[PDB]
């Protein structure tokens, strides 16, 4: 027993990093097959950050001006193409560790593993969650870039997602394997305000399930909800209402802990309304809504 | 910025994992060099487990009965020996994929990455603590014992802890790489309790620089404190005492945030003697410490 922010093992994706630099601008690059992907970015200098436009820029660019190195071994470029913000490097040599690998658009709400990386190399891996406003919480220094966040079955990587930028409430965005930012973030050196960030009451309902399986069942009480009712609830505390599809990925949460999901509902409800009052949940004083049903079933069931 | 609990990349220590079975027990091994490392109770069945006496138990076994699969492949044991609570299964073959280590034994209160494994494949990789009681807050299921804890230091990793028992209290106890037990724990079916767990002052402090460095500066006061007087405070609250070894090693963060270790002292008696009042630090509701002053520098730095 025991419940943990769990992130997947990374070794896949060390294996798939690389350094990209052009000019004198270095960020991570990701190499699958003959194709290095990394944010487009790379052709601007912090000048060209104020309002770019990559196509021009990109045209002042040939194969030679994109450094890609592979630990200690310089790849060789043959080709550079843009997909929307990402440029797709092809280089002569197919990595030898690529993975089985899928690319991926997550949905908010859903849970990756993040592999922080700078220079080509990997600092350290954390779970996060693509928050319902499309941003993520993540930990990324200057040269995180083309850092990616991905999940793993059994020996497939979905890679979903690769790191572009923090705006400037301190708080990332960046897009899918195909260049499209999650949400309405552009890569720019502009002002660009996230929408209102909403909690992921299906994880957090998920957690409690977790909780209970774990021995902490002292929020659990002698009430019920409906769904219409859970979620007038919800709204007035920012918390993303409550789906019947939601229940439906809960159900096996529900079997596990003989626990009806409006049941956990009127606990939430509870807890919501009233607070902790200085007690702890799964050691935490807050509602955690980074862990999905399926992470939940998954950590406590050990599947490899 | 931002700040995540964050785990090394687990790569290096994904290739030393090996399923090792003895009879019926299947458990994690540790592969590295033409040597596997694993938990000797392996060698039990659940009757032994009451009061096993290894060292007759291992008499009624040869390197035929411990079977050892790296991957798909099996290894061929030649030689066996318990060193303290681990068996050191000798192989024919060295390890390809043994990386640059050490084994070291860490103190109460340091910080590591394990990575949770089930019939020798990686599950997930988190960041724990060494509990000042020798304990740490894991998530392991059966047969997750044989995980191991470690840190890196740019390519030498530097194994701390293997998995051996989660203690009737749902915690989790474990030995170093020889096979000596962190605490005063033993490979036993007994009731076991930890000692009074305490709050790992130097690491909140740590963490609040942390947040500091991050944006969340609201717990900042006017106030001061001396290191008696805060310790008057930690002890009520089952803190750590703070010592001036903790002072020194806060150093490089007194020196990069302007603010005086005494001054933080003062910021986290206040917050221990009026609560968070409802806010959050770094987005935690409760004071974190699981985080050394070597992990937030190293995280706020990027080192890789
Ligand atoms: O934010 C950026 N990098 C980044 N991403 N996580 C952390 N960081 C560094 C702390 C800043 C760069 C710098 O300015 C911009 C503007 C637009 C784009 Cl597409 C990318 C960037
Ligand atoms: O606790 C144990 N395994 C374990 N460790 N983390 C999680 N778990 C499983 C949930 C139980 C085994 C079972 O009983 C004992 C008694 C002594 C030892 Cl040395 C080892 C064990």
Redesign the interface.
């Known amino acids: ?11 896949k994706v ?2 798939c990093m690389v350094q990209v630099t052009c000019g004198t601008t270095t960020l991570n690059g990701l190499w699958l097959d003959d194709v290095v992907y990394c944010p487009r970015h790379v052709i601007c200098t912090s000048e060209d950050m104020l309002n770019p436009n990559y196509e021009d820029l990109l045209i002042r660019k040939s194969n030679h001006n994109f450094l890609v190195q592979a630990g200690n071994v310089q790849l060789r470029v043959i080709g550079h193409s843009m997909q929307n913000c990402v440029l797709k490097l092809k280089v002569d040599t197919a990595n030898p560790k690529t993975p089985k690998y899928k690319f991926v658009r997550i949905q908010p709400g859903q849970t990756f593993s993040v ?5 080509g ?6 779970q996060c969650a693509m928050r319902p406003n499309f941003t993520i ?5 200057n ?2 870039c083309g850092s990616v966040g991905f999940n793993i079955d059994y020996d497939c990587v979905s890679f979903c997602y690769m790191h572009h930028m ?1 705006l400037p409430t ?3 965005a960046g897009t899918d394997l195909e260049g499209n930012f999650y949400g309405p973030f552009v890569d720019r050196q502009t002002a660009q305000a996230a929408g209102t960030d909403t909690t992921i009451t299906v994880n957090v309902l998920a957690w409690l399930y977790a909780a209970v399986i ?2 902490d069942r002292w929020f659990l009480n002698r009430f019920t909800t409906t769904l219409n009712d859970f979620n007038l609830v919800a709204m007035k505390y920012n918390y993303e209402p409550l789906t019947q599809d939601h229940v439906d990925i809960l159900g096996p949460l529900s079997a596990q802990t003989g626990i009806a999901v409006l049941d956990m509902c009127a606990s939430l409800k509870e807890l919501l309304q009233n ?2 009052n ?1 007690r ?1 949940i799964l ?4 509602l955690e809504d980074e862990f999905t049903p399926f992470d939940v079933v ?7």
Do not use: D, I, W
């Not at 027993?1 to 070794?11: D, E, L």
């Not at 998954?298 to 490899?304: I, N």
């Open positions: 027993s025991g419940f943990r922010k769990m992130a997947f093992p990374s070794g060390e294996g592999l922080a990386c700078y220079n190399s990997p600092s350290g891996v954390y919480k993540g930990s990324f220094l040269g995180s923090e301190g708080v990332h774990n021995g607070g902790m200085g702890t050691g935490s004083a807050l998954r950590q406590c069931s050990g599947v490899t």
